[PDB]
Design a protein around this ligand. Structure first.
Ligand SMILES: *[C@@H]1O[C@H](CO[C@@H]2O[C@@H](C)[C@@H](O)[C@@H](O)[C@@H]2O)[C@@H](O[C@@H]2O[C@H](CO)[C@@H](O[C@@H]3O[C@H](CO[C@H]4O[C@H](CO)[C@@H](O)[C@H](O)[C@@H]4O)[C@@H](O)[C@H](O[C@H]4O[C@H](CO)[C@@H](O)[C@H](O)[C@@H]4O)[C@@H]3O)[C@H](O)[C@H]2NC(C)=O)[C@H](O)[C@H]1NC(C)=O
Ligand SMILES: *[C@@H]1O[C@H](CO[C@@H]2O[C@@H](C)[C@@H](O)[C@@H](O)[C@@H]2O)[C@@H](O[C@@H]2O[C@H](CO)[C@@H](O[C@@H]3O[C@H](CO)[C@@H](O)[C@H](O[C@H]4O[C@H](CO)[C@@H](O)[C@H](O)[C@@H]4O)[C@@H]3O)[C@H](O)[C@H]2NC(C)=O)[C@H](O)[C@H]1NC(C)=O
Ligand code: PCW
Ligand code: PCW
Ligand code: PCW
Ligand code: PCW
Ligand code: PCW
Ligand code: PCW
Ligand code: PCW
Ligand SMILES: *[C@@H]1O[C@H](CO)[C@@H](O[C@@H]2O[C@H](CO)[C@@H](O)[C@H](O)[C@H]2NC(C)=O)[C@H](O)[C@H]1NC(C)=O
Ligand code: CLR
Ligand code: CLR
Ligand code: CLR
Ligand code: MG
Ligand code: MG
Lengths: 987, 294, 40
């Protein structure tokens, strides 16, 4: 309200003088470039951005890195205390602190890398398909990028277009704009060039930025561009989006919490145990750090952000642009698809196939030849038919088309009108001359209320009444509109027999799956209408009825190539497809039968009545699996009736349904408990698009209002792309589960040594430095490798998941990770431990109870099984050679676990080793383990000692055993559907 | 939930499943954890086979040998009051525990303790490390050899009047032959006098140059009166082939010890296959903190 | 087994470290090759 000063008071001359733009022509391109350079692009200054250093820093002091920081600090302080006391102390605490801090550094840089990757990929979706504007320059109308709009440019907007910048309305015809974002009221306000009010918020001749034109058309001049606009000031500072998370991310978070609580309880308890058992204050925190790190899966949040970002790039590659990240998750759950007939299933390239005049069915349209037509071009009725086809037609050909044939050229207008033009030019002659001879006095375009087209033409010839009215439309309606028919030049009144034959022709052509259009004309009497007589368009003066029906014209429109396979995949997938179209039930029923919506064998109530020769009312409604609901019937139906059709029928097709009724259909589909996706191109579709679970907007033809209203955008406007996208959506869940299943398996081998240490009273088999190396040091990359995975043959062959019953982390997951696979990686590490001690002189029987004496720095006399006497460091060295062995036995078993995890239904032989990131992980971990074991200095710094060669092999039988076991369990699942194995083991 | 997920009576479910499910899961886990246990036991049995009963396969982690001592001092400090008797009890109980194994009653008969040279001698090889000639025979080591620290005369061993003893001992290693330094011009100062080739010398000193003066007369007791270990008690054949085997011992009396002051005394053995470590402060040498506060 | 049985207490850790490093290097190379194979 405060910042308001406008040009609305200026007249056309004043506006022209100030802006300096040709009102009719618009500014020239050269001036446009100069203005663009001076003023700058038509865009809003972007917000600043977090610095690179602050984020990185958030990583250093985020996640659970805080615990490691406290541990490192404690180690440093402990070393400092040791400095005061006796001289020449052990730099053990000093190097321990140096190890923890490094872990935090590596984790911070890695997580930072992954987060940046995802943010940059999200930004790429901003300049793929931009937001445009229709401007007028040098007299020509052109489409240009929105940023290219300059002040003073003549912009034109129509119904459904977004307002590129604040404009001054020069001319308009029934333009209605919605200022809901500006004022708040959703009521559309009219816009006219007349100066209605002094204030900007009320003036009829000012269009504001960010608004959209609901209906009509208008032309204006850019008064403000970029940030200068009224809405721009509020949108820049006031409308900033906040950060948002998903439900996949929150299920994972909840789970992170439960595991964290159990882990912290176990830690603190072990801490008190160590103190009761005589350990050092520093070693107590050390044990706590090891237990917490070994139990809390810190990588899950990163693995989910990465999985969603990578999958999104795969979609954008396959024609599925998701406006939001939530849609990527919702697509996998799609249960029902409400798709349209024209634009999505078909191509919208009509061609004139057949005609019906002279009470006969005539073939036409020679295949790009001079053969003409199957019938006599001389026919008298044919002359009137082509006359109305050319005169009533709105479309015209563009320039530069004279070089090629008519089947190949371009046109401007509707698909049907274009088909009619191509037909008349091939068989009749030239439309330019025909339209010229019969001047069109007034014309009425296709209107929903009228449901017909209309054109008044003057006839230059003699013997005519000087008036020729021509109109086309729905054949059923035009036949009701005519009293006579032209046959071979002789006109005859329309009797019931002629109508019966006409209906037969309509049924014959419509059954074919062709769109039939009715055509008619009338020569109004000269006595009633003189030459001078003006016909009023606003108030119809001329007679609408008692016309002369010439004949019918039908066109063909093949479906897309990929569409049949797509419906087949949906049927195999368990997804329901509904066709909502404006056409006639015969054509709908047909197209649907051909594409696959109505498979063979299924019949509707009318079909069964027809076979049985019984009235449709008598037939049982439950007897038919599929049905074609009429729009009028849909309006008359109640909520229960709608639920009846949606529950009881497998294949539903809504014909003659207005796009507005889509909301009722979507609501009915949701009442059932299904996730629905609806396709929409126009403005009336927006409510349904918002109400539906997944709104799919047409990319090519969809308007800015629809695009804004939807979550997903179909770039090709094809239906198969939707199916391919849902295929990609299910892979996200499969890979996520395979990742959770992997990371969790190492918990049993990392924690069991501590438990055995306390209960068994044996020496510690696995240390904390090694635990950090396992979780934080090497598995970081293998955990991510599970997301790059491909899909399995069965991804489209299973049912849709329901959020109420299915969850990512279920009981069966814990059955496979903890119970079966884990316990095995624990035995493989324990085996390697027993072997190191046995070879060096400590046997297994002798080990139960040596801890009390073992951990006692003061007993330099420890006796082994063979009776030798060991010191403290000598004995400790063998213990450390066990921590390193354990470590390696873990990487070795990890091989079998990571390999088996790849697929859950099929074998790895069927799937294969085609994942490159995964293989890179097996080689890299093995390499890191060998490096940390063999490099010099590791003994003192990391406490890892060299491993002799006969030892590397101790974990091999447990790795082969894990692999063979999982292969057989996969086999039994594939062979016995719904068995005990699948109930218990399938996660 | 709370109540219903515990026990419902329509589906006859307990905790979530019915009777036949809990039974199939329990049976599966029992059989599974049985195959797992049997495999681990087999892979461990082959490991027991692999190794030998008379000799550890790897002997690189224990060489050279350490040097332990009795008493059992925590932090390597021996601090006690000459008045309060309940101050050196933890020490005497240990010293006694160690010497209680050299009792003459234990060493009796021809086996498996044979009488050896009362004066240091050379090595003695009782064959190879086999079971062919049964249990080998070990040399006898008498208590009395240690003169003022034997617990036979003054049970306390010295701690009673400000004169403590420290029984040093060399860590037992299988097949380890001690090799003393030769008489060549390069040898420490100390070692020159009394170069009995057959004796491994042990000599204590002060860690710092200052403490020298505050440390009095280090009086070593041992076999033959020398400050070392006789080579005749080697090598060691291991528990299995030499049960009832006694390792030599060396007593050290720290007479004339300054009162009320912490003294750092470092003892060190010398020899060819003897090497010290800056990390392990018990490899070849040992440190003791003594403070007779009275 | 005689006085000069010093071998019974020696292990060539040097050669072991050398070989373990050669192997680690080889594995690392193989890894990188596979990772970049397709991106060239
Ligand atoms: C190895 O030798 C140890 C010593 O052997 C003695 O000396 C050798 C040279 C031979 O002459 C041998 O025959 C001697 O016995 C041997 O340890 C000794 O075991 C006896 C039997 O238990 C102990 O006698 C008991 O003494 C206590 C009081 O002891 C005080 O002194 C010791 C230090 O010497 C302190 O540690 C104590 O705390 C006390 O301050 C008496 O109260 C006890 O009474 C019992 O006997 C009387 C009859 O005499 C009865 O009326 C009572 O009811 C009791 O039943 C005993 O007299 C002797 O103290 C102990 N010596 C030492 C130094 O501890 C050791 O057992 C041998 N080990 C092996 C494996 O052969
Ligand atoms: C281990 O080594 C020592 C030292 O050996 C000597 O030094 C070595 C590094 C090497 O060069 C050897 O060749 C060299 O001998 C042995 O002990 C030494 O023994 C000699 C001989 O008894 C002593 O020499 C004596 O020195 C006396 C004064 O210090 C002198 O009065 C003595 O007179 C004797 O000899 C003369 C002839 O020269 C004779 O006329 C006299 O009547 C009398 O017999 C004699 O010269 C050394 O002092 C000794 N060294 C030390 C440090 O005490 C030692 O015996 C040897 N041990 C074994 C087991 O082999
Ligand atoms: C992916 C994440 C998973 C795992 C992450 C683990 C994070 C850990 C991070 C840092 C740990 C640093 C450890 C520092 C290394 C040793 C430094 C040191 O404190 O050494 C001290 C020793 C001195 O010992 P001393 O005198 O007591 O010995 C006496 C020997 N006596 C007596 C027997 C003769 O120094 C020496 O021995 C000299 C030997 C020097 C060693 C050179 C090795 C270089 C070390 C690291 C570089 C490797 C990076 C990898 C690059 C890959 C490229 C593709
Ligand atoms: C004197 C006192 C003596 C006491 C003695 C007690 C001895 C106890 C013996 C064994 C304990 C067994 C523990 C296993 C618990 C399994 C819980 C589970 O299965 O819950 C799954 C749930 C929901 O799953 P769902 O959707 O399929 O439900 C389907 C429900 N329907 C189908 C019925 C409708 O999921 C969730 O709650 C969310 C995920 C929760 C994840 C929990 C994982 C545990 C994490 C750390 C603990 C690790 C310690 C390992 C060391 C153990 C010591 C050896
Ligand atoms: C908390 C979750 C833990 C998960 C896994 C933990 C792994 C723990 C495994 C072992 C730790 C226990 C310590 C073993 C030491 C016991 C020693 C022993 O047992 O000495 C008995 C025999 C030795 O005979 P000898 O030849 O010396 O006698 C010669 C007789 N003459 C010559 C006179 C004829 O040793 C034998 O026979 C073989 C005994 C070797 C080890 C057997 C241990 C028990 C058997 C399987 C354990 C795995 C259960 C898996 C359960 C999965 C679900 C948890
Ligand atoms: C002494 C006893 C030791 C026991 C230890 C146990 C260790 C673990 C045990 C087993 C794990 C290894 C199993 C390897 C599996 C090979 C399977 C295979 O070969 O399936 C042939 C495939 C199929 O082909 P297709 O065209 O019909 O597929 C059509 C796919 N559709 C239909 C989607 C188009 O062919 C392909 O995948 C294309 C060619 C891929 C070749 C992969 C070779 C690399 C394999 C492993 C890498 C090594 C990692 C370890 C690193 C440590 C080294 C130091
Ligand atoms: C004595 C100890 C050492 C023994 C070593 C043996 C090495 C064997 C070497 C290669 C194995 C043979 C290659 C297998 C190729 C199979 C090709 C194929 O057509 O497979 C398809 C089948 C799955 O068909 P489906 O489920 O669709 O049928 C559905 C039927 N309906 C429709 C009725 C449900 O696949 C399956 O049977 C896969 C099931 C195979 C499970 C056995 C795993 C073998 C163990 C290790 C392999 C070696 C790899 C590691 C090497 C380490 C070297 C040191
Ligand atoms: C060091 C590590 C070593 C690890 C070695 C592990 C070896 C142990 C492997 C398997 C042993 C477990 C066998 C358990 C058998 C009793 C289970 C049972 O009671 O099951 C009952 C069901 C029959 O009921 P239903 O479904 O008809 O009733 C329908 C029920 N209503 C009404 C709810 C729909 O049974 C069925 O379905 C049949 C399913 C039977 C399960 C087959 C699983 C085989 C898996 C692995 C064997 C391969 C070992 C290869 C090792 C090579 C080593 C070198
Ligand atoms: C993109 C991929 C690029 C890959 C290109 C690779 C190019 C090839 C480069 C190296 C290949 C192998 C080099 C072999 C030399 C290793 C040095 C070595 O054998 O040293 C051993 C001795 C340690 O002494 P000791 O055993 O007597 O101790 C006593 C042991 N006790 C305590 C058990 C008794 O060294 C010492 O004394 C002095 C040590 C001096 C410093 C050695 C440096 C070692 C650290 C890093 C170099 C290795 C990098 C490998 C890169 C792998 C990528 C992950
Ligand atoms: C034991 O140490 C004492 C000193 O604590 C020595 O005796 C001292 O000798 C000096 C002369 O050098 C006299 O001035 C002191 O009065 C003496 N003090 C005592 C308490 O006697 C003694 O010589 C040393 N004895 C041995 C064998 O080392
Ligand atoms: C160290 C030893 C004694 C511990 C043995 C623990 C065993 C008995 C524990 C470890 C994991 C546990 C299983 C974990 C998950 C499930 C799934 C649930 O729906 C039924 C119980 C069941 C199948 C548990 C049964 C008991 C189980 C197998
Ligand atoms: C495939 C699976 C089920 C086979 C498991 C076989 C189990 C039962 C076998 C494998 C190795 C066997 C052990 C091998 C050696 C010995 C030593 C002997 O003095 C007593 C029996 C004992 C301890 C055996 C008991 C049974 C045992 C553990
Ligand atoms: C794909 C699968 C089957 C490959 C398995 C490769 C295994 C066998 C490789 C990976 C790393 C290798 C080890 C790497 C380093 C050393 C140290 C050297 O001084 C002796 C060989 C030894 C111990 C290698 C033995 C073989 C080994 C364990
Ligand atoms: Mg929405
Ligand atoms: Mg882990």
């Amino acid at each position: 309200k405060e910042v308001s000063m406008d040009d609305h008071k200026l007249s056309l001359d004043e506006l022209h003088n100030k802006y300096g733009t040709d009102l009719t022509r618009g500014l020239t391109n050269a001036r446009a470039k100069e203005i663009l350079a001076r003023d700058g692009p038509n865009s809003l200054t972007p917000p600043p951005t977090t610095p690179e250093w602050i984020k990185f820093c958030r990583q250093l002091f985020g996640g659970f890195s805080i615990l490691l920081w406290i541990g490192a600090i404690l180690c440093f302080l402990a070393y400092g205390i040791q400095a005061a006391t006796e001289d020449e102390p052990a730099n053990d605490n000093l190097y321990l602190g140096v190890v923890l801090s490094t872990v935090v550094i590596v984790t911070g840089c890695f997580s930072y890398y992954q987060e940046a990757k995802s943010s940059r990929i999200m930004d790429s979706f901003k300049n793929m398909v931009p937001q445009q504007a229709l401007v007028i320059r040098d007299g020509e109308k052109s489409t240009i990028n929105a940023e290219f709009v300059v002040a003073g440019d003549l912009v034109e907007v129509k119904g459904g277009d977004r307002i590129p910048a604040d404009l001054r309305i020069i001319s308009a015809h029934g333009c209605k704009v919605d200022n809901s974002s500006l004022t708040g009221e959703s009521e559309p306000q009219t816009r006219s060039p007349e100066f209605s009010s002094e204030n900007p918020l009320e003036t009829r001749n000012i269009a504001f930025f960010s608004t959209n034109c609901v209906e009509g058309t208008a032309r204006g001049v850019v008064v403000y561009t970029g940030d200068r606009t009224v809405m721009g000031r509020i949108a820049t500072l006031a409308s900033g989006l906040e950060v948002g998370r998903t439900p996949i991310a929150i299920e994972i978070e909840h789970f992170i919490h439960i595991i964290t609580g159990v882990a912290v309880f176990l830690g603190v308890s072990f801490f008190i145990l160590s103190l009761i058992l005589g350990y050092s204050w520093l070693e107590a925190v050390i044990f706590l750090i090891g237990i917490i790190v070994a139990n809390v899966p810190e990588g899950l949040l990163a693995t989910v952000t990465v999985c969603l970002t990578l999958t999104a790039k795969r979609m954008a590659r396959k024609n599925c642009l998701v406006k939001n990240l939530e849609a990527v998750e919702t697509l996998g759950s799609t249960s029902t698809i409400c798709s349209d007939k024209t634009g999505t299933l078909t191509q919208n390239r009509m061609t004139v196939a057949h005609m019906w005049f002279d009470n006969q069915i005539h073939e036409a349209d020679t295949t790009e030849n001079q053969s003409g037509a199957a019938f006599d071009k001389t026919s008298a009725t044919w002359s009137a038919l082509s006359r109305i086809a050319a005169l009533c037609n709105r479309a015209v050909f563009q320039a530069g088309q004279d070089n090629v044939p008519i089947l190949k050229r371009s046109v401007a207008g509707d698909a049907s009108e274009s088909a009619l033009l191509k037909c008349i030019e091939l068989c009749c002659g030239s439309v330019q001359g025909m339209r010229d001879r019969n001047p069109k006095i007034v014309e009425i375009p296709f209107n929903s209320t009228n449901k017909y087209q209309l054109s008044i033409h003057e006839n230059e010839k003699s013997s005519e009444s000087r008036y020729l009215l021509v109109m086309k439309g729905a054949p059923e309606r035009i036949l009701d509109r005519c009293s006579t028919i032209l046959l071979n030049g002789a006109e005859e009144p329309l009797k019931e027999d002629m109508k019966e034959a006409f209906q037969n022709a309509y049924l014959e052509l419509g059954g074919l799956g062709e769109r039939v259009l009715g055509f008619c004309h009338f020569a109004l009497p000269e006595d009633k209408y003189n030459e001078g007589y003006p016909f009023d368009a606003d108030e119809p003066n001329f007679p609408t009825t008692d016309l002369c029906f010439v004949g019918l014209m039908a066109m063909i429109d093949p479906p897309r190539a990929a569409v049949p396979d797509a419906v087949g995949k949906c049927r195999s997938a368990g997804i329901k497809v509904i066709m909502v179209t404006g056409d006639h039930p015969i054509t709908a029923k047909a197209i649907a039968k051909g594409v696959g919506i109505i498979s063979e064998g299924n019949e509707t109530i009318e079909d069964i009545a027809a076979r049985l020769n019984i009235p449709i009312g008598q037939v049982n409604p439950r007897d038919a699996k599929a049905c074609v609901v009429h729009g009028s019937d849909l309006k008359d139906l109640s909520t229960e009736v709608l639920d009846d059709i949606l529950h009881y029928h497998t294949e539903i097709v809504f014909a003659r349904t207005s796009p507005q009724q889509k909301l009722i259909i979507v609501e009915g589909c949701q009442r059932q408990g299904a996730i629905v996706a609806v396709t929409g191109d126009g403005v009336n579709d927006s409510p349904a698009l918002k109400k539906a679970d997944i709104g799919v907007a047409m990319g090519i033809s969809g308007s800015d209002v629809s695009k804004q209203a939807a979550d997903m955008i179909l770039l090709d406007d094809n239906f198969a792309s939707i199916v391919t996208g849902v295929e990609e959506g299910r892979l996200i869940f499969d890979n996520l589960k395979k990742s959770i299943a992997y990371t969790l398996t190492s918990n049993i081998p990392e924690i069991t040594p501590f438990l055995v240490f306390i209960i068994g009273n044996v020496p510690l088999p696995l240390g904390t430095v090694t635990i950090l190396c396992i979780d934080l040091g090497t598995d970081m990359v293998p955990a991510i490798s599970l997301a790059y995975e491909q899909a399995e043959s069965d991804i489209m062959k299973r049912q849709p998941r329901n959020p109420k019953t299915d969850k990512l982390v279920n009981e069966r997951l814990i059955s496979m990770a903890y119970g079966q696979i884990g316990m095995i990686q624990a035995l493989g590490g324990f085996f390697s431990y027993f072997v190191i001690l046995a070879e060096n002189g400590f046997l297994p029987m002798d080990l139960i109870g040596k801890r009390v004496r073992w951990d006692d720095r003061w007993i330099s006399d420890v006796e082994d099984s063979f009776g030798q006497q060991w010191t403290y460091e000598q004995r400790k060295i063998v213990e450390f050679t066990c921590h390193t062995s354990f470590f390696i036995s873990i990487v070795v078993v990890q091989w079998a676990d990571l390999i088996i995890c790849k697929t859950r239904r099929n074998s790895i032989f069927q799937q294969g080793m085609k994942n490159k990131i995964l293989i890179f992980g097996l080689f890299e971990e093995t390499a890191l383990a060998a490096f940390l074991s063999y490099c010099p200095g590791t003994d003192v710094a990391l406490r890892m000692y060299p491993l002799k060669p006969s030892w590397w092999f101790c974990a091999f039988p447990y790795s082969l055993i894990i692999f063979l076991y999982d292969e057989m369990r996969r086999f039994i699942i594939r062979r016995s559907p719904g068995g005990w194995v699948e109930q218990e083991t399938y996660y | 939930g709370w109540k219903k997920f515990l026990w419902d009576s329509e589906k006859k479910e307990f905790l979530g499943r019915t009777g036949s499910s809990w039974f199939k899961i329990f049976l599966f886990y029992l059989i599974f954890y049985g195959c797992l246990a049997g495999i681990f036991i087999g892979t461990i049995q082959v490991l027991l086979l692999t190794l030998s009963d008379f000799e550890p396969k790897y002997q690189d982690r224990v060489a050279p040998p350490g040097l332990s001592h009795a008493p059992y001092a925590i932090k390597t400090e021996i601090s006690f009051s000459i008045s309060n008797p309940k101050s050196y009890e933890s020490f005497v109980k240990s010293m006694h525990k160690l010497m209680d194994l050299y009792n003459e009653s234990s060493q009796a008969g021809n086996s498996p303790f044979e009488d050896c040279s009362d004066t240091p001698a050379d090595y003695i090889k009782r064959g190879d490390l086999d079971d062919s000639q049964g249990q080998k025979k070990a040399c006898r080591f008498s208590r009395m050899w240690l003169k003022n620290c034997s617990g036979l005369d003054d049970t306390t061993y010295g701690y009673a009047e400000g004169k403590p003893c420290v029984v040093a001992k060399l860590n037992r290693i299988i097949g380890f032959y001690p090799k003393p330094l030769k008489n060549t011009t390069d040898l420490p100062e100390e070692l020159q006098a009394n170069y009995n080739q057959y004796v491994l010398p042990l000599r204590c000193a002060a860690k710092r140059e200052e403490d020298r003066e505050k440390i009095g007369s280090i009086e070593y007791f041992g076999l033959g009166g020398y400050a070392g270990f006789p080579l005749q008690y080697y090598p060691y054949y291991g528990k299995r082939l030499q049960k009832k085997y006694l390792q030599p011992l060396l007593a050290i009396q720290f007479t004339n010890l300054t009162q009320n002051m912490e003294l750092r005394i470092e003892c060190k053995v010398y020899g060819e296959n003897i090497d010290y470590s800056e990390k392990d402060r018990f490899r070849g040498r040992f440190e003791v903190k003594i403070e007779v506060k009275s | 087994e005689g006085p000069d049985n010093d071998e019974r207490f020696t292990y060539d850790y040097y050669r072991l470290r050398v070989v373990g490093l050669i192997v680690a290097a080889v594995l690392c190379v193989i890894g990188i090759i596979i990772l970049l194979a397709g991106k060239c």
